[PDB]
From a paper:
[name] exists in all Archaea, except Crenarchaea, and is a replicative polymerase responsible for initiating DNA synthesis at both leading and lagging strands5678. It is composed of a large catalytic subunit ([name]) and a smaller subunit with 3′–5′ proofreading exonuclease activity (DP1)5. To help resolve the uncertainty concerning the evolutionary origins of D-family DNAP, we determined the crystal structures of two large fragments of both DP1 and [name] subunits of the [name] [name]. While the interaction between the two subunits is essential for the full activity of PolD71413, both DP1 and [name] constructs described here are capable of digesting mispaired 3′–5′ nucleotides and of extending a DNA primer in a templated manner, respectively. Both DP1 and [name] crystal structures were determined individually by experimental phasing and refined at final resolutions of 2.5 and 2.2 Å, respectively.
The [name] construct covers amino acids 1–1,050 from [name] DNAP subunit, leaving out a C-terminal domain (CTD; 1,051–1,270) dedicated to interaction with DP1 (refs 13, 14). The [name] structure reveals an extended molecule with overall dimensions of 55 × 60 × 110 Å3 and four domains: the N-terminal domain (NTD; residues 1–285), the central domain (residues 308–667), the catalytic domain (residues 668–996) and a fragment of the CTD (residues 997–1,039). The most prominent feature of the [name] architecture is the extensive interaction between the NTD and catalytic domain, which results in a wide interfacial crevice that hosts the DNAP active site, formed by two double-psi β-barrels (DPBBs). Unexpectedly, [name] [name] and ‘two-barrel' RNA polymerases (RNAPs) share a conserved architecture in their active sites. The peptide chain connecting the fifth (β31) and the sixth (β32) β-strands of the barrel forms a right-handed α-helix followed by a 10-residue-long loop, which constitutes the most conserved sequence motif of [name]. This motif comprises two invariant aspartic residues (D961 and D963), which were previously shown to be catalytically critical for [name] DNAP activity. The DPBB is preceded by a helical region composed of three α-helices (α24, α26–27) and a tandem repeat of two zinc modules, named Zn-I and Zn-II. In both cases, Zn2+ are tetrahedrally coordinated by two pairs of cysteines located in turns, but apart from that the two zinc-binding modules bear no structural relationship to each other. In particular, the peptide chains connecting the NTD to the central domain (residues 286–307), strands β7 to β8 (residues 358–364), strands β8 to β9 (residues 376–392) and strand β18 to the catalytic domain (residues 654–668) were not visible in the electron density. The 50 residues of the CTD present in our construct are partly disordered, except for two helices α32 and α33 (residues 1,011–1,039), which bind next to the interface between the central and catalytic domains through interactions with the DPPB-1 and helix α32.
Residue numbers in the entry: 4 to 285, 308 to 323, 339 to 357, 365 to 375, 393 to 445, 451 to 653, 668 to 997, 1006 to 1034
Amino acid sequence: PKEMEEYFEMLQREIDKAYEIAKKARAQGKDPSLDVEIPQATDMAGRVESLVGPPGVAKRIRELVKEYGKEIAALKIVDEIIEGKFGDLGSREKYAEQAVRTALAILTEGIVSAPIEGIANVKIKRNTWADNSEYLALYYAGPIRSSGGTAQALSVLVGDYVRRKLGLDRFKPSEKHIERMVEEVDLYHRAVTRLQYHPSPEEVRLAMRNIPIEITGEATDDVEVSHRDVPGVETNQLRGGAILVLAEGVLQKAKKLVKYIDKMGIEGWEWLKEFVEAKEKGVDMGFYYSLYQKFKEEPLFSDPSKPGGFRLRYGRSWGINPATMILVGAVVTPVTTIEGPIVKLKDGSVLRVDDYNLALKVREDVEEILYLGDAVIAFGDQTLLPANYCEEWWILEFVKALKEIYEVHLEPFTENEEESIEEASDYLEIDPEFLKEMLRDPLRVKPPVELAIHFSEVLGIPLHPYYTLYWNSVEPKDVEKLWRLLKNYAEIEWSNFRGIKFAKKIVISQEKLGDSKRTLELLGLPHTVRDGNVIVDYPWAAALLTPLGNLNWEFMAKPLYATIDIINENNEIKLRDRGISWIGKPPVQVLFPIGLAGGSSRDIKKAAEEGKVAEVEIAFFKCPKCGHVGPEHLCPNCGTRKELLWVCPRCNAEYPESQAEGYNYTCPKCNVKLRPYAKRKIRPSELLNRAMENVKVYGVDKLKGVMGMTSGWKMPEPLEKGLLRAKNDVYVFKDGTIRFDATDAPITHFRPREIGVSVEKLRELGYTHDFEGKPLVSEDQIVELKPQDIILSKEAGRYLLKVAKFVDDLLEKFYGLPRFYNAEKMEDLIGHLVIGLAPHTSAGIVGRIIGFVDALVGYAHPYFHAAKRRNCDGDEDAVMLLLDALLNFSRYYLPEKRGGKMDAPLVITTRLDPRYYPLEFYEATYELKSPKELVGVIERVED
Ligand SMILES: [Zn+2]
Ligand SMILES: [Zn+2]
């Protein structure tokens, strides 16, 4: 649709405006990179290319996914990479690395960080202790944990496919290789991290003897092992990344992994299928009174007489009348054919409200909601509730009676044969066009009460449910009382249709009726109060008196009988129950290490004020122009971009980036690897005073940094960024972003009034029509939510306003750029963009703020925060302002070792591109079955 395409284009314009500002800011060289560190993508193909490449892959992925699906496509890409279709990548090791990252990113839809943060390296090595044959090794980093077990297990299968395509042999561990792993898993689980799945020593041996690649990595934890100096294992400490992949990946997710091996047809994994099966192999009573009794056996201020909730309605696939939306995981959808609420007005009048227009008219006069309305819930879903009598059930009984009595064959919810409609019309004394419409749409086309009664009389069918009151909501003793008051004090006007005598109008004094007025309300009887009288007009006078036999038989309360049981025992016209079932800190301002110098609160301002010196592991930069050394990116003397100094951890020799690159990040006269940082003496007073001068902000209360950096780089964030955060009362996350940790609920529809946004604002946002396709002109209209449009809580809005003020201060004071947001109130953020990031994911989704709710839980479209991610059991989301993330996020701030629940936005997604049950079903709900038993019932009926 052109409306959706225009929406996606509007978002691109807004995204591009944010990237142009951030590119200008980053070009200045005050940050770890001269570029914006968050690439954007349209789709999973684009996510793959943007994250790990190779260039031109996204185009191939689209073609391959369209032909073969995601799983097979990943293998086809590995083949093409190795064949050189994406250019000469150089060494077999560079081809292996590219094919590993790309294929794993394809399989994980570019949603997780395993291809970037999880795999540090891919190496070709030899089984020197064995046959000296070549094999593939994957070097896993501790942050692999952030991607979940499924991603970890798939990296192993990808590694195996890649090594086979490169013609490499299998990894053939020595007995010392296997035992070191057994030891490592034990020591890791015991004192580092408790494994989600803790394998037995023999399970570790099984995995180790059968995984065809080496699951390895650099040391993640300073914990010495006893199986030391193993050939090919370049550490004597714990390889946490590897341990996680083996236990929490391959063994924990072994059942999910075998499904992938099956979809992909990879051989040599029978040992894993055998592991999965081994884990598996080791006085009389009334009908309704009886039904309500069995039904029980299977808020304190609330009215006991009033049943709580919506009237259950089984759907063949949630569904709510627009009038109940105005007057009152699951997603609500407007359905105009089902029933709305039953309301009592201030004047005492009782009314059914089944349309949007009537709901608006009575809204100001509603005194009580007697009945909430229907809720259409799909049977697809374990105790199953008895079905409420409804038009769907009644129409089936109506057509069964025509077949049984007259041999006329008719079907509901379809076009019928003219001759059959005519035959039945002649027997029923009705209009063929009326019958056609009632059969086609029984929820919309109801007969008048006299014809409903005539249908029951002729066909022996229960009274139509539209004319069935909530008889069983009332105790039989109260119907008995009501009966006497009507018999003695009511003035009744009668009518006669084809020999059927029925009530046309009931007039009873409010005085004479008394307490029984409450019985009429509980019955859901529509009535009016005028001139001290209760008046029951047509068709409701017959709905009341026809089940009571026009007061020709006396209603008497009987023990162990429900009201409908008494009616059904004594009345010619029979009923079914229309209402039996009812439903319903933070502690950091700047990423800057202060050690113990800022006391217990890591206060940089206190450290600088007390003239304290800090000894912290921190990265230093050398100026090539003058020679200045310090923790900043730009030179404070000549303003030229400074070069990172690499340090040898032994001789403490300093080597600038280019010199370190020549020496392959290894000291030229020590065989030990260089570090981008060292333990250094820091003088916060000179650093903070310069930062204060730069941004012209002095009056900060406190400035909370970190005790130490958890990144591999230990490259601090500029203090200027912290000063502006403290000024704006905002706090930073580990990666340089500011996040609001929210809980959101899925929605598909909204009303402007409910989100506190005007019709004109929404028209400017591109909303043209309501759910019915009618022009959007009222704040009360029900509107369909656009896929990336989100409603935040007022709590989110209150914090985000502060973030917008920090971004604007940063742009102007630190970057010398114009302000962007200019927000004073949270409503100024409507139309502005955010990044939504779910737990265990590294692909954020672009969202547009369209409104705010007074509640703690915000709203988003089901596509924005999928039920699948919500089943990876995080209803929590993190929200960042788009521009805050583009300016302030850096991969150089990512944790080196710890992989938690919350990951980073490694990429952002800019586009989110997208009859009836048989009679036997309804009858079977009365015999209290489960849906397993009932699906069998429906499947057998559909021969
Ligand atoms: Zn300089
Ligand atoms: Zn050295």
